[PDB]
Design a protein around this ligand. Structure first.
Ligand SMILES: NC(=O)c1ccc[n+]([C@@H]2O[C@H](COP(=O)([O-])OP(=O)(O)OC[C@H]3O[C@@H](n4cnc5c(N)ncnc54)[C@H](OP(=O)(O)O)[C@@H]3O)[C@@H](O)[C@H]2O)c1
Ligand SMILES: Nc1nc(=O)c2c([nH]1)NC[C@H](CCc1ccc(C(=O)N[C@@H](CCC(=O)O)C(=O)O)cc1)C2
Length: 159
C-alpha cells in the first residue's frame, strides 16, 4: 500500500530541512523507524536537499530528466515510481509538496508529525478531507533538551 510521511507546522506548512526552524531529533527518529527497510519515493528537490541516499531504504527519485547519480533509482512518472517498488507491503512517499499532491489520492495511510511552530513558508501539505481518514494513533511530546518544539505524532488511515 502507499503511505505518505510529513512534518507539518501550523497551518500544514511544509519545507526543506534548512528551511525549517525547528530541531527535533525525536521526529527524525520517528521518520527513520517508519521508513527503514521500505522503498522511499521523493521529488528531485527533496533528494537534492537530502544530499545522500537514505541508508537501508531503496531510494527512488522522480524527475522529468535523466538521472545524475547512480546511487539511487531514477523514474519519470508516478506510475513508473510505484512499479519500481515491486511487491512490497508499504511504500513510503516522502515529498515534496508536488509529490504529496500526486500520491495522496492513492494513499491509504498518513504518518504525520504536528509541530507547534508558526513559520511563514511556501508549501502546505495537501488538504486531506477529514471525512476520509480516521486517526488511529497519536502521541504528544513537549519540548525538551534535544527537541526544540512540542510535537505530536499521528497516524491516519483511509476510511
Ligand atoms: C513554493 C511552493 C512550491 C514550490 N516551492 C519551492 O520549490 C521546490 C518545491 O519543492 P517540492 O516540495 O514541490 O519539490 P519535490 O516534490 O521535492 O520535487 C519536485 C521535483 O520532482 C520531479 N517531479 C515531481 N513530480 C514529477 C512527475 N510526475 N514526473 C517527473 N518529475 C516529477 C520534478 O523534477 P524535475 O524538475 O527534475 O523534472 C520536480 O521538479 C522547493 O525549492 C520549494 O521551496 C516554493
Ligand atoms: N516526519 C518527518 N520529518 C521530517 O523532517 C520530514 C518528513 N517527515 N518527511 C519529509 C522530509 C524529508 C526530509 C528528511 C528526511 C530524512 C532525513 C534524514 O536524515 N533521515 C535519516 C535520519 C538521521 C537521524 O537519525 O536523525 C534517516 O536515516 O532516516 C533528513 C531530512 C522531512
Amino acid at each position: 500500500m502507499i503511505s505518505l510521511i510529513a512534518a507539518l507546522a501550523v497551518d500544514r506548512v511544509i519545507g526543506m530541512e534548512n528551511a525549517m526552524p525547528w530541531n527535533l531529533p525525536a521526529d527524525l527518529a520517528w521518520f527513520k523507524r517508519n521508513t527503514l527497510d521500505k522503498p522511499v519515493i521523493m521529488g528531485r528537490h527533496t533528494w537534492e536537499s537530502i544530499g545522500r541516499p537514505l541508508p537501508g531504504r531503496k531510494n527512488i527519485i522522480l524527475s522529468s530528466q535523466p538521472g545524475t547519480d547512480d546511487r539511487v533509482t531514477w523514474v519519470k512518472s508516478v506510475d513508473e515510481a510505484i512499479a519500481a517498488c515491486g511487491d512490497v507491503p508499504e511504500i513510503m512517499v516522502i515529498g515534496g509538496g508536488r509529490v504529496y499532491e500526486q500520491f495522496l489520492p492513492k494513499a491509504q495511510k498518513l504518518y504525520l508529525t504536528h509541530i507547534d511552530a508558526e513559520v511563514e513558508g511556501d508549501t502546505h501539505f495537501p488538504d486531506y478531507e477529514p471525512d476520509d481518514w480516521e486517526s488511529v494513533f497519536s502521541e504528544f511530546h513537549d519540548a525538551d533538551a534535544q527537541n526544540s518544539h512540542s510535537y505530536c505524532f499521528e497516524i491516519l488511515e483511509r476510511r
